[PDB]
Design a protein around this ligand. Structure first.
Ligand code: FAD
Ligand code: MTE
Ligand code: 290
Ligand code: MOS
Ligand code: FES
Ligand code: FES
Ligand code: CA
Lengths: 162, 305, 758
């Protein structure tokens, strides 16, 4: 029985008895106590559980950064992968990330349940493209639902990054 | 990388480091589920209560992750993410001349309002194809284009073009039990070859009744006379199907209003839905199979002149 | 004083960082267990056996709960017509039968699917048409009826009659239903943390099920990740079962519903069938009107009767109808009980209104703005239920919207586009709304607050309203700060709890800001009176000085407030007395482009002018206009719930059920709050804003209809006075099938015809 080793916000995780059936969302919320990442559907559709994943791409040099749905990612696929959650990019206790700060001051968050995933979708874009186009910004959120805002204020807060 | 083995309450997961390992694992355990993105297996397990007691994850294997340019097209390993396929084809499309990228731009059109960045960054090419959902948006494009599939078991290797026979039954492919999908070559389009792909806005049932297609015509050189014609559809049966009776009739006919009429006659009849057909929208679905061909018909006349 | 200022939501930054705690983000006790509901897979059946042998061997497996485990009462629901757990018969597909308790949520799910229920089917009634035909209704016919109906119809140049269906809607709050129940071990005591808009009825129904006094049961609500009406009552289906688990095990128990359970079980917006008949002049002035409404209620009364009163109160939209009869029936069906959803019967009856209004205009061959404007109430008019319209501001909204949206110029560009385009069409439509402000059951227009000032001068405000994303707590803090004359930074609200404010009404009916703002304001005023001697003694001193002087002089710095909406009491017999305290008004103009070959459309541009009085927070208020409009656009165009013939929901997730997405919204999206329009009837000259702008989403629907009319002029026939039925939601299926042409047809084929034209 081999050890599964990954990172969550820069911190090594050694899981000595990984269960194949454990999703990453379950593991963050209930083993690691990191509950900013939300459950909205458990099926890939809403984005509430959006995280960033990083890994060394052996075929391209490059560490690559991309977004995933924590609700569908088996932790057993994540050996030597680095996970970044909403609590890994900033906090009110320390310093907010610009993504977090903008969505909040722009009236992009009402109930707030979708806000962590939208933040991590936006954060991922910017890790790949620090000067996105307005187009790239809108397409960043294809996988993220919000029931509250009607979307205008979110996209508007974020065009400041373009 | 060494092979890892995780063992749970009900499931054993082997993470294969090497192609050779996989083909041996799958020969010992032909039942074993390949998992790459889990964007399908996770849903089957959680919502359909499928237990698969053996999982191989072949995601580490280079070969399954290779992107190879070639004289006939661009090959992607089966474990490659749709985001990568998407990115590479966009570069192919910006770089190559319109007449070579007809099929590519069909893939991109299906990839456009497909899921979201999260799904595409993890969903594998090979997982879509072998999943064989009746409503797969890619498999109609792959079938209509004869996209070549390299299939390996331990000892054997073969490359087949995707055609109607690659999908015999519901949720089933024409890979033998010890076999895996290794790579997929999506072809350049030739001169006098035009391609379109379309999809239904609405989906409403879990794996049925969303109309989606790929449409390919090859003319005799410089001409408007049909040499080959493929029209393949998802969301009209329990699998991806080709309108084969209808398009056979048009070989050596010309691209005119009469062809338009005859293809609609053929499609209306050959893809006809019983009133009790799974998913309903019996009439909407029929209108779309014709309306999609008419958009293709008109696009192809624009390309001809 | 931050009143009138665009202050970000108080929790926004913590919501951004994932530090805001929702109910499942609360830490587990070391012993805390997990509940999973067991639910009917049949519409109507007898339960023959339950068998828990396989769930029993499922690792950490604790127990299965059923009707027999309940210490007090199995009778529940707003009208005492539901079971906590079904005993002898099941009456809908998500009907809760029992519950598995286990040590992890994973183990509780595993055990729940392997519980074997054996059934014997019974005749089921699913559609409104099944219920109409079996005479399967709850209660008697509600009715409103003014003027002379045959006399209006006799004087009528034109009479049009018809039928319309409007589909239901899932709330799709991003956070599903969730309760944590902690049993204390002493005297029946229990402490619950729930995602609910109704802490009072949670507290009551838990107490009733347990057979314990209400004073034993504490309910706490920090926030919800959305409610939209669906956590007004049906939250208790989870809350009550989790409490029994807690009772029975002695351990803390929690449940968060998965999306697919949430949509099956917890109910949605009411589908409506209407049969209508209008009588009108050649000018398009309406003279008679009769509408029979049928709601699909589902398997329990819930808020069904009250949704129908609000329906009937809105069947006029903004239109003076001198002779007018509206009726309503609630159909009793073997579907999950339907409930409150932002709008509460108003969107449905207003959509019926706007549909016949659209038919009148087409029948008369007149421009639709003019027929609507012509028929609009003026200041001071009475409505069909006899309440007068003071500060009736829809004409300013109309004017300003007509002008700001450049409607008349865009009208020509839409015509031009349709003369030049064959297989794509555009539509443009300006639509009004008025929505009546107050709960329809008068006794709910009551609000309490408790305010404490601590000896450092810091203020803790508690009120009976809950936060679900709508900025209530932000607005209450803005008010307290204005009323007390201290910085917002000195004021905090923590949560809502039945031990700080008892007997509260649901945070519903858009009135929370009005009524809790009024209660909070009165607490502040009593605190200011108690402080005034010390202010008098030390006028150039500080709040902190005075608060300490009042403490050291043994003056209390804790006080209740309360508020009662005055002059309410509409009677159905007699048909008189005020139903509402006032009305919120707005106007939306929307343009679309349809693809006549596919059914797709783009929302091209929308302009909205809303009257919200003097806004407390114009950022929160424009955000309410925006989200409300987009849930309306979802209702009328995207969101479609679909069932099997045998009553089972097919659409149980985001992959089969389509709420608006980032790319769904109008490319050009403008909301304006009407200027210089203070409301004397509510707190600081403000108006309710929550549910009112949702119906304005219909402006996209009537824009799509107009774009279908244009497609049908092109390819289907030549009569420009044609009336074709378009039900809601206008999906791609409905949009495409209405665009009758050579494909629909097949006249290409050919053919023969047709209608199809050639
Ligand atoms: C929210 C959401 C929306 C989606 N929308 C769309 C859509 O609009 N259109 C569309 O087409 N799809 C859509 N999908 C489906 C998605 O594209 C597929 O689920 C995905 O590509 C499957 O890839 P995977 O790597 O996740 O496969 P997995 O779930 O890991 O595996 C799926 C199947 O493929 C098999 N498999 C994988 N690799 C191989 C191999 N090399 N050889 C043999 N078998 C193999 C496995 O054994 C298994 O049966 C959506 C999915 C989600 C979650
Ligand atoms: N973000 C958000 N806004 C929302 C809701 C919600 O759940 N989330 N509910 C709406 C509904 S249905 C109503 S009645 C009001 C209720 O609160 P209020 O009375 O303070 O507006 O908020 C509206 N706006
Ligand atoms: C309970 C209730 N009564 C009303 O009159 N209007 C409402 N809107 C939302 N909920 C309600
Ligand atoms: O008044 Mo909103 O809760 S239906
Ligand atoms: S929880 Fe909805 S996408 Fe993961
Ligand atoms: S803010 Fe509530 S879902 Fe986005
Ligand atoms: Ca309703």
């Amino acid at each position: 029985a081999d050890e599964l080793v990954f990172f969550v916000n820069g911190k090594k995780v050694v899981e000595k008895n990984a269960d194949p059936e454990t999703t990453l969302l379950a593991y963050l919320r209930r083993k690691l106590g990191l509950r900013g990442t939300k459950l909205g559907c458990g099926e890939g559709g809403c984005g509430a559980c959006t995280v960033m994943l990083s890994k060394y791409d052996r075929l391209q040099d490059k560490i690559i950064h991309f977004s995933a749905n924590a609700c569908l990612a088996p932790i057993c696929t994540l050996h030597h992968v680095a996970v970044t959650t909403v609590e890994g990019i900033g906090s009110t206790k320390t310093r907010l990330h610009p993504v977090q700060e903008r969505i909040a001051k722009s009236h992009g968050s009402q109930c707030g349940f979708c806000t962590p995933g939208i933040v991590m979708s936006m954060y991922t874009l910017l890790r790949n493209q620090p000067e996105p186009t307005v187009e790239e910004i809108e397409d960043a959120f294809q996988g993220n639902l919000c029931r509250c805002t009607g979307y205008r204020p979110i996209l508007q807060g974020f065009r400041t990054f373009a | 990388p060494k092979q890892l083995r995780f063992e749970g309450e009900r499931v054993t997961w082997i993470q294969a480091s090497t192609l050779k390992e996989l083909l041996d694992l799958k020969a010992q355990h032909p039942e074993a589920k390949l998992v790459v993105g889990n964007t399908e297996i996770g849903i089957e397990m959680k919502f359909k209560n499928q237990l698969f007691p053996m999982i191989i994850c072949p995601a580490w294997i280079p070969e399954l992750n290779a992107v190879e340019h070639g004289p006939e097209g661009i090959s992607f390993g089966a474990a490659c993410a749709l985001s990568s396929v998407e990115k590479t084809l966009l570069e192919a499309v910006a770089k190559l001349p319109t007449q070579k990228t007809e099929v590519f731009r069909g893939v991109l059109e299906q990839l456009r309002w497909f899921a979201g960045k999260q799904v595409k960054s993890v969903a594998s090419l090979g997982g879509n194809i072998i999943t064989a959902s009746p409503i797969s948006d890619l498999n109609p494009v792959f079938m209509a284009s004869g996209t070549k599939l390299t299939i390996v078991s331990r000892g054997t290797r073969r490359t087949v073009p995707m055609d109607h026979t690659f999908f015999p039954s519901y949720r089933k492919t024409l890979l033998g039990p010890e076999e895996i999908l290794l790579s997929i070559e999506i072809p350049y389009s030739r001169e006098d070859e035009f391609f379109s792909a379309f999809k239904q806005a609405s989906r409403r049932e879990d794996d049925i009744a969303k109309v989606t297609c790929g449409m390919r015509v090859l003319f005799q050189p410089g001409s408007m006379q049909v040499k080959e014609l493929a029209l393949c559809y998802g969301g009209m049966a329990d699998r991806t199907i080709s309108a084969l009776k209808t398009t056979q009739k048009q070989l050596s006919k010309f691209w005119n209003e009469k062809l338009l009429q005859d293809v609609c006659a053929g499609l209306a009849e050959e893809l006809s839905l019983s009133p009790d057909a799974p998913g309903g929208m019996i009439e909407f679905r029929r209108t779309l199979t014709l309306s999609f061909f008419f958009k293709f018909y008109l696009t192809v006349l624009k390309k001809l002149g | 004083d931050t009143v009138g200022r665009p202050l970000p939501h108080l929790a926004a930054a913590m919501q951004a960082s994932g530090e805001a705690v929702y109910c499942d983000d609360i830490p587990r006790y070391e012993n805390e267990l997990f509940l999973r509901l067991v639910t009917s897979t049949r519409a109507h059946a007898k339960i023959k056996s339950i068998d828990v042998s396989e769930a029993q061997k499922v690792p950490g497996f604790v127990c299965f709960l059923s009707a027999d485990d309940i210490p007090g009462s199995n009778e529940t629901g707003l009208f005492n017509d539901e079971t906590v757990f079904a005993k002898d018969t099941v009456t809908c597909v998500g009907h809760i039968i029992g519950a598995v308790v286990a040590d992890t949520p994973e183990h509780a799910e595993r055990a729940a699917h392997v519980v074997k229920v054996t059934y014997e089917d019974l005749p089921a009634i699913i559609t409104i048409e099944d219920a109409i035909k079996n005479n399967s209704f709850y209660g008697s016919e509600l009715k409103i009826e003014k003027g002379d109906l045959k006399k209006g119809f006799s004087e009528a140049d034109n009479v049009v009659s018809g039928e319309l269906y409007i589909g239901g809607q899932d709330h799709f709050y991003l956070e599903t239903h969730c309760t944590i129940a902690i049993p204390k071990g002493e005297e029946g005591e229990m402490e619950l943390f729930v995602s609910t808009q109704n802490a009072m009825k949670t507290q009551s129904f838990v107490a009733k099920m347990l057979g314990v006094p209400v004073n034993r049961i504490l309910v706490r609500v920090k926030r919800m990740g959305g409610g939209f009406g669906g956590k007004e009552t049906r939250s208790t289906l989870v809350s009550v079962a989790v409490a029994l688990a807690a009772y029975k095990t002695g351990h803390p128990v929690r449940c968060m519903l998965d999306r697919n359970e949430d949509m099956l079980i917890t109910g949605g917006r009411h589908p409506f069938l209407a049969r209508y008949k209008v009588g009108f002049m050649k000018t398009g002035t309406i003279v008679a009107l009769e509408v029979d409404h049928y709601s699909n209620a589902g398997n329990s009364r819930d808020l069904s009767h009250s949704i129908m009163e609000r329906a009937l109160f809105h069947m006029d939209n903004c239109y003076k109808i001198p002779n007018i009869r509206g009726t309503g029936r609630l159909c009793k069906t073997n579907l999950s009980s339907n409930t409150a959803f932002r709008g509460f019967g108003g969107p449905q009856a207003l959509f019926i209104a706007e549909n016949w209004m659209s038919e009148v205009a087409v029948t008369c061959g007149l421009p639709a703005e003019e027929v609507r404007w012509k028929n609009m109430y003026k200041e001071g008019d009475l409505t069909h239920f006899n309440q007068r319209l003071e500060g009736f501001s829809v004409p300013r909204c109309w004017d300003e919207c007509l002008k700001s949206s450049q409607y008349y110029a865009r009208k020509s560009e839409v015509d031009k586009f349709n003369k030049e385009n064959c297989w794509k069409k555009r539509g443009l439509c300006i639509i009004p709304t008025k929505f009546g402000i107050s709960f329809t059951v008068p006794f709910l227009n009551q609000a309490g607050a408790l305010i404490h000032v601590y000896t450092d001068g810091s203020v803790l405000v508690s009120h009976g309203g809950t936060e679900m994303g709508q900025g209530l707590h932000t607005k209450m803090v803005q008010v307290a700060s204005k009323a007390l004359k201290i910085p917002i930074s000195k004021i905090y609200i923590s949560e809502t709890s039945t031990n700080t404010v008892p007997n509260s009404s649901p945070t519903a009916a858009s009135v929370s800001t009005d009524i809790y703002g009024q209660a909070v304001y009165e607490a502040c005023q009593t605190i200011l009176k108690r402080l005034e001697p010390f202010k008098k003694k030390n006028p150039d001193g500080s709040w902190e000085d005075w608060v300490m002087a009042a403490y050291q002089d043994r003056v209390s710095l804790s006080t209740t407030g309360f508020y009662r909406t005055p002059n309410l009491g509409y009677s159905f017999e007699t048909n008189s007395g005020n139903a509402f305290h006032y009305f919120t008004y707005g106007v939306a103009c929307s343009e679309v482009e349809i693809d006549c070959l596919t059914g797709d459309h783009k929302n091209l541009r929308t302009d909205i002018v809303m009257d919200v009085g003097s806004s407390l927070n114009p950022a929160i208020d424009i955000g309410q206009v925006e989200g409300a409009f987009v849930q309306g656009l979802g209702l009328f165009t995207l969101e479609e719930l679909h069932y099997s013939p045998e009553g089972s929901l097919h659409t149980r997730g985001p992959s089969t059920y389509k709420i608006p997405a980032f790319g769904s919204i109008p490319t050009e999206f403008r909301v304006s709050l009407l200027r210089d329009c203070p409301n004397k009837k509510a707190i600081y000259a403000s108006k309710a804003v929550g549910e009112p702008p949702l119906f304005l989403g219909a402006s996209v629907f009537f824009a799509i209809k107009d774009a279908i009319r244009a497609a049908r002029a092109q390819h289907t026939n030549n009569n420009t006075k044609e009336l074709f039925r378009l039900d809601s939601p206008a999906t791609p299926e409905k949009i495409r099938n209405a665009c009758v042409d050579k494909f629909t047809t097949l006249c290409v084929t050919g053919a023969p015809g047709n209608c199809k034209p050639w």
